[PDB]
Design a protein around this ligand. Sequence first.
Ligand SMILES: [Cl-]
Ligand SMILES: [Cl-]
Ligand SMILES: [Cl-]
Ligand SMILES: [Cl-]
Ligand code: NA
Ligand code: NA
Length: 129
Amino acid sequence: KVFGRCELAAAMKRHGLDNYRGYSLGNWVCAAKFESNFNTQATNRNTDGSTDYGILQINSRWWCNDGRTPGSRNLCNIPCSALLSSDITASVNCAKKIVSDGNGMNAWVAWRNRCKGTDVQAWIRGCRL
Ligand SMILES: [Cl-]
Ligand SMILES: [Cl-]
Ligand SMILES: [Cl-]
Ligand SMILES: [Cl-]
Ligand code: NA
Ligand code: NA
């Protein structure tokens, strides 16, 4: 599914991401835009052989099992394919574990390079939430 901007913000809000660990909703919308262009079916291979899945590009090196990332972990305890669903629950619940792992949203390179230090509230401007 390709979400609209405000549609995704509302879904993320209902799943408890607004100010989760102190990250306002616009941070999560901005990260999703630059990680996946709001497309739940986004996949992207990494140089080390791991793959990133779904709207928040969660990587199989640590967080999910795809059966083809040798020597990896599965700390969200889910198949990576679950992260491609039009239902974002699994992506959001796994993201809550990632953002709590000590580095906050710096775990998402695109967030650090494209969202951090910008006016992220613009990403939710106009939305009925
Ligand atoms: Cl947009
Ligand atoms: Cl914030
Ligand atoms: Cl959903
Ligand atoms: Cl933090
Ligand atoms: Na915001
Ligand atoms: Na894995």
